[PDB]
Design an enzyme around this catalytic site. Structure first.
Site, PDB file in Angstrom:
ATOM      1  N   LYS A  49     -12.880   3.471   0.910  1.00 33.33           N
ATOM      2  CA  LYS A  49     -12.572   3.502   2.333  1.00 33.33           C
ATOM      3  C   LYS A  49     -13.735   4.165   3.060  1.00 33.33           C
ATOM      4  O   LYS A  49     -14.117   5.295   2.737  1.00 33.33           O
ATOM      5  CB  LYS A  49     -11.264   4.242   2.597  1.00 33.33           C
ATOM      6  CG  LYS A  49     -10.061   3.608   1.931  1.00 33.33           C
ATOM      7  CD  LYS A  49      -8.822   4.485   1.977  1.00 33.33           C
ATOM      8  CE  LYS A  49      -8.446   4.884   3.401  1.00 33.33           C
ATOM      9  NZ  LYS A  49      -7.148   5.673   3.434  1.00 33.33           N
ATOM     10  N   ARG A 107       0.849  -1.185   0.000  1.00 26.52           N
ATOM     11  CA  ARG A 107       0.000   0.000   0.000  1.00 26.52           C
ATOM     12  C   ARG A 107       0.886   1.237   0.000  1.00 26.52           C
ATOM     13  O   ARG A 107       1.797   1.348   0.826  1.00 26.52           O
ATOM     14  CB  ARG A 107      -0.924   0.009   1.221  1.00 26.52           C
ATOM     15  CG  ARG A 107      -1.596   1.350   1.522  1.00 26.52           C
ATOM     16  CD  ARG A 107      -2.453   1.244   2.783  1.00 26.52           C
ATOM     17  NE  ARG A 107      -3.202   2.466   3.080  1.00 26.52           N
ATOM     18  CZ  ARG A 107      -2.854   3.345   4.021  1.00 26.52           C
ATOM     19  NH1 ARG A 107      -1.767   3.151   4.752  1.00 26.52           N
ATOM     20  NH2 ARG A 107      -3.589   4.429   4.224  1.00 26.52           N
ATOM     21  N   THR A 121      -6.121  -0.617  10.186  1.00 27.43           N
ATOM     22  CA  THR A 121      -5.639   0.439  11.078  1.00 27.43           C
ATOM     23  C   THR A 121      -5.569   0.003  12.536  1.00 27.43           C
ATOM     24  O   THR A 121      -6.571  -0.413  13.126  1.00 27.43           O
ATOM     25  CB  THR A 121      -6.485   1.711  10.949  1.00 27.43           C
ATOM     26  OG1 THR A 121      -6.582   2.076   9.567  1.00 27.43           O
ATOM     27  CG2 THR A 121      -5.824   2.835  11.695  1.00 27.43           C
ATOM     28  N   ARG A 130      -5.163  19.255   7.220  1.00 26.70           N
ATOM     29  CA  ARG A 130      -3.836  19.160   7.812  1.00 26.70           C
ATOM     30  C   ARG A 130      -3.429  20.501   8.414  1.00 26.70           C
ATOM     31  O   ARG A 130      -3.781  21.561   7.887  1.00 26.70           O
ATOM     32  CB  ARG A 130      -2.810  18.719   6.768  1.00 26.70           C
ATOM     33  CG  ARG A 130      -2.998  17.283   6.291  1.00 26.70           C
ATOM     34  CD  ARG A 130      -2.352  16.305   7.250  1.00 26.70           C
ATOM     35  NE  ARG A 130      -2.557  14.921   6.833  1.00 26.70           N
ATOM     36  CZ  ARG A 130      -1.941  13.876   7.378  1.00 26.70           C
ATOM     37  NH1 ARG A 130      -1.073  14.054   8.369  1.00 26.70           N
ATOM     38  NH2 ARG A 130      -2.194  12.650   6.929  1.00 26.70           N
TER      39      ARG A 130
HETATM   40  O1  LIG Z   1      -7.045   5.935   6.115  1.00 26.68           O
HETATM   41  C1  LIG Z   1      -7.101   4.944   6.893  1.00 26.68           C
HETATM   42  O2  LIG Z   1      -6.680   3.803   6.540  1.00 26.68           O
HETATM   43  C2  LIG Z   1      -7.716   5.128   8.271  1.00 26.68           C
HETATM   44  O3  LIG Z   1      -8.153   6.255   8.601  1.00 26.68           O
HETATM   45  O4  LIG Z   1      -7.799   4.148   9.052  1.00 26.68           O
HETATM   46  K   LIG Z   2      -4.313   8.223   2.456  1.00 22.89           K
HETATM   47 MG   LIG Z   3      -8.121   7.669   6.918  1.00 22.06          MG
END
Ligand SMILES: O=C([O-])C(=O)[O-]
Ligand SMILES: [K+]
Ligand SMILES: [Mg+2]
Ligand SMILES: O=C([O-])C(=O)[O-]
Ligand SMILES: [K+]
Ligand SMILES: [Mg+2]
Lengths: 504, 511, 506, 511
Positions: C245, C52, C303, C99
């Site tokens: 995501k 990744r 994560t 950010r």
């Molecule tokens: O972007 C990601 O993988 C997260 O926030 O867990």
């Molecule tokens: K990212």
């Molecule tokens: Mg994220």
């Protein structure tokens, strides 16, 4: 007990005797073979719970005398209240029947012969092999050329070859012996007779006068038919239960609205299997039993269950299977018609339904049944509903000998029966009509308490519970030191207390 | 729940459906410097603490007597309102057959760095017990050379440092560092695969257990239980005076897992003590042992605690990692009766946030249990009985599901009646009304039991008494927001005073 | 084999070894700790299946070099086609990130202190204890007095006290050390930013040019976001898999329409656990995994799975539990982020996910899982669906060593994987991209046949089947005399897999 | 089968929902005077007869040879069109250890009336063997006096007449009539509970079985099987030349139910022979034995036949009773592979209507099966095996449910591959293509199998031979209306000729 239905079947054991209690009620049709007080006493001893009166035949005076004999026989056991068995009386209406006339005593109809159907009343007592009168004055409006007409439980069949304005010319398809006043079926025809005729109204009022417990309403096709019977019974007969007989295609098609309006259902397989193909009757039977089970309303399986026992002391293997499978399907009651009304072996027929029903109840796969009934019943804020299902669950957990339910109206015991415990449900009531009507519900063994009411609530409760304990001990449902479940109120409509108690 | 399959049940989980107020899973908090003050203990109780664990691997009797005093001062500060009073149990966690290193020497840095490939000598010469460093390490297991061989692995400090024995001596070992790291003072040592011959109940353990009986603790968490006779010896030490103290066997080595059935039979409950367990057996196998043990305790109807590192990052952080939130929820989904905090409450910077987070997660997880399958399976795996109390219990739980009751109210003297209800895992909270303070404290061990302590005098007429304690439960449930007037609750009572007569189930509206 | 899940749990045995095959794909975030060819080689040996690339950081030149290193390490094993493991490349977009600026270095933020948030770009490199710059220029239009603002993995938290024009005055609720360019979360606020920024379009076009296998699209909120990603990849990138995501409330609320539009899903638990309450993440996780299993689309759990191993050589007990439970839930892949991108023990982190996933796969209650997957999946006239479920049933009946599937596009193998056999699914392809993308699907062990195409189709089938036989024997999945299931077509090309055979291993 | 519960599945049964064309349950017809002519047998076949039963309780070898000839003549009248040709099996039902009375005397009425309470003397004096009347009754069991006691019950004529033994003698018994009735000639006698010592296989039975082998019958229905050694005796008599003939053990007494498991193991199949069974055990227990045996046969994958009085009233009437309609349907719902007709076709007035009624009821009942539960349970109770044939079969059945296929086509030599498919009870008809005529006729014993006999020469190319037979099956299904062009079917083939190599399953569109 087995984890699958197939394993459960594989473990069925002919050498394992059943329990004493028989949960399926037995409905017997009374007639010449079973009308004497002496025979009725034996019927009761053999297991009859409901005496059915077929109002397709007989005068009111004939039926008033039958009712009188039934009550004489039933009350002959009343001197011992612990052993007294309530016996209910059912009035089965004639309804929109079609009947032939009087043979001018039979004649032989031959296949291929011509037979003319007349509505001329000059022939209503002069039927023979050439001419046949029937009482449906509108038949020519509803049948066509090529239509089939069935006579005498569908055994004789005729094909319409010509249609006049007030007569038919037919050809005999299946012939045989034709007697007097035989039933006629016109499957597929839009028969326009009323659900409740003038005779039916007179018969229903007679039932109210005679204090019958239930009405078996023939040929119910829709909810408005049930409402009509209900209107006739009126305020005076408002507590008489209406059981709708499903016996044509429209009644099956409209079954859901009929069920909602009715107190219960009879799968009236005689007419039903002439009106729809015989190979479809088992589908309708299982559909209706399941839907009644799901709704908590009584369902009766009826007609020809032990038919060969009209002339034989033993049933055929198909009849033994049919009774057992009706119980396994979920039927609350099973019924006898010709086998007890006119047969040579009326007591043997009752004893066989008792024996088969008891074996079949022992073979029920309660593991799955209890799961699915609970899965299919909604959540509720009714405390009596929650107490009933809790009591049944407790009864499986300790294999109790019985669930004892004190009930005024019957409602409490009905709610328990809907969840189908294995243990018998001893319903203790002071209401004699409640005790008679409770026979419609699988598992309910009604007992009629006659001790006077106690002023203190708790004392009157303990009295009825001890009564049930003595009944159960006397009938051999349980013995001292067994565990039973007891449902009571804490104050009609307040059944919310379950107790797990050892028999004293 | 309601979906016909577990897979559809997962698909229907909704983060926007709030859970009920009641939280069924007990929270056990280890008390230490961060949580010892009366002030902080009062906030721990408010945040959700149900059981205070005293870790006797550390601390003197004077120290622990003061901890118990402070727990009880904080608990009884809420007693002036019996409706809102929460019982708080006290648990003694034995040291057991621990192996520990000595103190790092005075000179040099506070910790020594053990570097991969370096040599490290292990000595039993007491001249080094406070002069440990990177070249020589003392430990207190004087028989260690007898039970290890060349090639043996030795783990130190939560298994983080690993040594391999290169040479064996009379009273020393020469080892090579494999996984290096920083070594502090008095760290735990594990010898997985070695036949360690320390007794399950040491002389120190006997004095600690006798101290627990005198201080009236509610339960003992027995470290490193390996067989049923270990449990019997603890039971024998507690003796007649401590016969009502519950013994929770900690399973933390391969032998305890192997002999689990006999240990469970002899014990009052089980702790899955994952810290030591994950060093004694491969870390990737711990979840198997946890799920096996929770399943078997669920089957036997005995309490099971999931313990150790559940919210470990909250020792230094105000929120947990995603793995930690998932761990707490899955312990509850597994069927654990209680969950536990160790360093998070004993020494960390955020003890109250750790308690609050376990309360929040446990409540969400309880709402996610697939009760349809669980209740069916518990019933199928439980034997038929002629016991009226057991039939009443399962009948009450079924009724609780049928009407979605706000609670199951259970009047109980020993706790047993309420424990029998808890074994069938109702969704609704079980309000256990008792006049026995110890019963009320020990009831925290069972999933779903919310214990309340009635302090009203016994009414002369039994029926009146019963109604008094039922109405007490009604007031508690309304005050805690478990239900309101017009809701339906289930009420379990006996037919006569005393233990063993619970046979009556009522479905009643709340006043 | 137990009749209940409860009894199944009771029978779990720590002394029963799992099979050799590990069915769950492992995705590793590449970073400073794992970027070198030498380390990438060991990552592959340790079990990494997908690399990744996190485009929240780094230039195109930086990521191009990362990809070159991955392919150098991966092709270093090509010498032996039977032991060669395909490795996919995933582009993880920056997305609508917020950010902070540069501290210009860390400041301490004390609880109760005042902190001013400014949009004034003069302070953009002058962040300190008093003034903090962040790049979200409409932030004042979406926040309100009293709102919470989370900085740096949600660990610092601020409450808005006063709202100005280009300014916010906050009080520090949760303090801590504050570095440069940290991520900001505004949970509950309706943030305006595009799901596909202009930088994202340049990054996606770069991915197409670099021949990446999949895109991990950050912060997907609705189906049209996915449509926009598909449009940018265009005709040239039409075979790149798009994984949405899910990491905010809107994505959970609109999950069904997002799944329908996506090739798969990532449960992005880092941002998700700051956007919604931390105690609710497990519910969202199991919901999305369940819905993806039901739809037959890949789902990645991501994560902080082994977070403590960024600094420690062994994981905590909660981390061991989390990995195992992700697999038990039904996740097709598990992911490592900081553990491999920047931590001290990247190889140990990979080895641990491999070990836990294999133990967990052996603990799955297949009896119930296979029953329910079939019940929920429609009746179909598609012959390959019927063949796939037939192959899985057959594999359970004869306890087969593998299901061997020949597939051009992957689809035939993906249809088997949806029904979740215990046995590994050896997917034989000559399409290298098919072989890399197959890692997204639980159970699929892709193998890349390099033999030339035989003139006789029947011989070319047997050749590819014999290849899988040799792979399975070499990896220890089965031995001579074992029985395997083989799925093949009846004529060349995609979309004709209709033939199932039960055959002994030669 | 789509509802989540069996109860809702019942609630959804729809009398207006037509069934599929295929009828899966085999129909066995007893041949006799009513059904013996070639012209009537042709109509029997068209009406649905699959198996012709020869009852060797009656008739000579000459008589039965002619029956067999006529059955074969009628069957082969359809042989010109192999697409529509239906194989017809021939079954030999042994007499076995029957006990029968003699002939009523010539004088007086044709049948004698036995009256309740009358005395009836049973004699073994052969001078009375054709002079039975209401005072004296001869029977052919010469050892009867040694196995009955005073008090025993003797039953005569389908158990309709009952006698109680009141006095014993060396060659006689004095009885009292209990259940009276009309007594005809050569009626069956039952001695329930008595230790009847007639052999399982008499010398007459041995001559009949040897004649069966010589006439190439397909199966033997062995009467009154009590134990596995009875079955072994039938198998030994059939010998090498008869080794492919299927032995169906008829269970019709208490010991056969008691020893069912060892009988089933030794047999190729079972008949629930409810006629004698319901006299040997109480009538109310027959349904329990029927359902047990059907279940255990389904679990074992062996054929089970439900027999006797299924449509009894149709011996005299053109329509059955409601109980008869329900009995046939419930036999199919129980899991019976075949159903049978006895007097209904052997001597009744309505043989063709009886066959047609069984075909109509069986088809409706097959559409009402709850396959959702049945398929799950059959798989759970079946062993894991390394047998590749068995894995192929369950995989094709799973695939058939997944795509709602019109048929499962199975190429088979011995029948076994198609038997293995049928054991898992697919909804779809199983078209079993064989070149072995005996395989084709014997395939009627298995629920779901529609056997077709390929009359094409073997092709040298194996692959081309397979394709020829598969397309034959395609044409059969299209002609019979099982499917049309574009429908989807499952095809099972082997990887080389001969038995035991079935290992290939394909999902193919109908061309
Ligand atoms: O972007 C990601 O993988 C997260 O926030 O867990
Ligand atoms: K990212
Ligand atoms: Mg994220
Ligand atoms: O032999 C038979 O078929 C019977 O008795 O049912
Ligand atoms: K009537
Ligand atoms: Mg420990």
């Amino acid at each position: 007990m087995a984890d699958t239905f197939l394993e459960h079947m594989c473990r069925l054991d002919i050498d394992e005797p059943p329990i004493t209690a028989r949960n399926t009620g037995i409905i017997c049709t009374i007639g010449p073979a079973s009308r004497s007080v002496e025979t009725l006493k034996e019927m009761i001893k053999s297991g009859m719970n409901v005496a059915r009166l077929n109002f397709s035949h007989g005068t009111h005076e004939y039926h008033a005398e039958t009712i009188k004999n039934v009550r004489t026989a039933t009350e002959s056991f009343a001197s011992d209240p612990i052993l007294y068995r309530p016996v209910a009386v059912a009035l089965d209406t004639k309804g929109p029947e079609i009947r032939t006339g009087l043979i001018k005593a039979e004649v032989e109809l031959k296949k291929g012969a011509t037979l003319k159907i007349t509505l001329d009343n000059a022939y209503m007592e002069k039927c023979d092999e050439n001419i046949l009168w029937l009482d449906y004055k509108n038949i020519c409006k509803v049948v066509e050329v090529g239509s089939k007409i069935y006579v005498d439980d569908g055994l004789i069949s005729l094909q319409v070859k010509q249609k006049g304005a007030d007569f038919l010319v037919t050809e005999v398809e299946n012939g045989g012996s034709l007697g007097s006043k035989k039933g006629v079926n016109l499957p597929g025809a839009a028969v326009d007779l009323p659900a409740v005729s003038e005779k039916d109204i007179q018969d229903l009022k007679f039932g109210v006068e005679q204090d019958v417990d239930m009405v078996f309403a023939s040929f119910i096709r829709k909810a408005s038919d049930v409402h009509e019977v209900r209107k006739v019974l009126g305020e005076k007969g408002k507590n008489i239960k209406i059981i709708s007989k499903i016996e044509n295609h429209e009644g099956v098609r409209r079954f859901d609205e009929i069920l909602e309006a009715s107190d219960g259902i009879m799968v009236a397989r005689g007419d039903l299997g002439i009106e729809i193909p015989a190979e479809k009757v088992f589908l309708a039977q299982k559909m209706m039993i399941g839907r009644c089970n799901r709704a908590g309303k009584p369902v009766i399986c009826a007609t020809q269950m032990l038919e060969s026992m009209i002339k034989k002391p033993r049933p055929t293997r198909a009849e033994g299977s049919d009774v057992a499978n009706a119980v396994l399907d979920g039927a609350d009651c099973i019924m006898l018609s010709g086998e007890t009304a006119k047969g040579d072996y009326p007591l043997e027929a009752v004893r066989m339904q008792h024996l088969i029903a008891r074996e079949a109840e022992a073979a029920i796969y309660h593991l799955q049944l209890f799961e699915e009934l609970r899965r299919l019943a909604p959540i509720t804020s009714d405390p009596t509903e929650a107490t009933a299902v809790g009591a049944v669950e407790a009864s499986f957990k300790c294999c109790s000998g019985a669930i004892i339910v004190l009930t005024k109206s019957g409602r409490s015991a009905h709610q328990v029966a809907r969840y189908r415990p294995r243990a018998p449900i001893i319903a203790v009531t002071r209401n004699p009509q409640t005790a008679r009507q409770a026979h419609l519900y699988r598992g309910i063994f009604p007992v009629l308490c006659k001790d006077p009411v106690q002023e203190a609530w708790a004392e009157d409760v303990d009295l009825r519970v001890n009564f049930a304990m003595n009944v159960g001990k006397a009938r051999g449902f349980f013995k001292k030191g067994d565990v039973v479940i007891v449902l009571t109120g804490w104050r009609s409509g307040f059944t919310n207390t379950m107790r797990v108690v050892p028999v004293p």
